[PDB]
Design a protein around this ligand. Structure first.
Ligand code: SAM
Ligand code: SAM
Ligand code: NA
Ligand code: NA
Lengths: 238, 228
């Protein structure tokens, strides 16, 4: 039995083989993207990259319980292949999330400038957890116009007030190496509940564990890098 | 003989077989999305929708010249499959364009609210036309620890696009595509013309066009607008 709530210094396949099947409620995975940003992100070909990816995906799917949720980050191009692969495995597509980075980067002169990233969101069944009221976003200028057209329409004889926490979150996200904590927070608030178990087999700086712990979720995870693991476990403990 | 610069009332498969191979520089295609918005947009299965889609794609690819470009709109989910199909046909991926509609109309309570649309942009070779200076957009400025003045012509356009509002595509969006990926006098193809947006913008930009739609009312009205 693998110790929960501590990041382990393990290869993802070794780690995954130690995880109990059907024990995980949410898996949030930011894996290699094949962009050659490091030795672990360099592959000989696109097929080798996909074979590696599909191998870890298969194991992660065995870990999810019957209604579990899955989020996988990658470039849009790699997500096209991963999306079709997940459909072929029986997973249920929920959303193609677009992270609009709006950074200063991506400049190109043979094509539009890059930088967006994709998050695929699938679930094991149609009875997954989706806490929509916990991830609402601030109302726009245009939501307020709609609010004005409905203000005079009474409900049950009285004025109706729209939710004070904002509008339902959509699929194109914009925020203020590690993923932004607010981004991972939206994922964990929407697709898990307090005390559920969250898995991340490429922990990196430990963002998934850190945010899971702050939100009262349990986590299980690993990274092959000793320095990253020790540094993240230290952050978790204070 | 197939008339150039006219929208034809034809089925897309018959129309494409009349178009000469290797004659087109840019194809801008907004096809069925399988969202059941009409009889032509309703398929019995996803597999049937993909078989139909690959059939018209194969013919479109034959119409592009050796360095031609292709834009195909669809939902993100269907573009995942179309993207992989285009890669298997030897086309070169350039961008996964995200159209963020900023549509205030959310009501999903089982997943995030929908509305985004994707435009896949591929080329036949690495020597395609890409007029990056014709599609710059609006942004001293902090960048890398330094302070800079913006390029006065605007910044290079990226891949997540915001353009307000069958539902005809926004003329400004289609204009960005035709300015980026074609030149004056090139030929633009669209085999699912609908209201005629691709033809109208192409004509306003000094490009030639050819296209079709099976709907007689759409073709006549579009041809009306083009003639005026
Ligand atoms: C893109 S990063 C994760 C970043 C993380 N989301 C965070 O916010 O910092 C992927 C991580 O995968 C780890 N890694 C790469 N290949 C691995 C493998 N086969 N097994 C385990 N860890 C691996 C790397 O050491 C790196 O820290
Ligand atoms: C999404 S709409 C095109 C909208 C267009 N981009 C516009 O801006 O108005 C798809 C169009 O496909 C046409 N259509 C559907 N199936 C067709 C087929 N097999 N052959 C030809 N036209 C077809 C429909 O009549 C409809 O006008
Ligand atoms: Na779907
Ligand atoms: Na690529």
């Amino acid at each position: 039995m693998l110790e929960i709530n501590k990041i382990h210094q393990m290869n993802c396949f070794d780690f995954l083989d130690q995880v109990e099947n059907k024990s995980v409620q949410l898996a949030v995975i930011d894996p290699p993207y094949n962009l050659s940003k490091a030795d672990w992100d360099s592959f000989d070909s696109h097929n080798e990259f996909l074979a590696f990816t599909y191998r870890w995906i298969d194991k992660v799917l065995d870990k999810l319980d019957k209604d579990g949720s899955l989020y996988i980050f990658n470039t849009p191009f790699n997500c096209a292949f991963i999306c079709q692969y997940l459909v072929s495995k029986g997973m249920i597509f929920q959303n193609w999330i677009t992270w609009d980075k709006r950074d200063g980067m991506g400049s190109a002169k043979r094509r539009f400038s890059t930088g967006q990233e994709t998050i695929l969101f699938f679930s094991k069944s149609k009875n997954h957890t989706f806490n929509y009221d916990e991830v609402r976003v601030p109302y726009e200028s245009t939501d307020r116009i709609k609010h004005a057209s409905e203000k005079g329409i009474l409900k049950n004889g009285k004025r109706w007030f729209p939710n004070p926490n904002g509008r339902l979150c959509g699929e194109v996200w914009h925020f203020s190496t590690p993923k932004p904590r607010d981004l991972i927070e939206r994922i964990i608030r929407a697709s898990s509940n307090p005390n559920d178990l969250v898995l991340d087999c490429f922990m990196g700086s430990g963002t998934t564990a850190i945010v899971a712990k702050k939100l009262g979720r349990n986590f299980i995870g690993c990274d092959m890098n000793a320095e990253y693991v020790n540094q993240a476990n230290f952050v978790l403990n204070q």
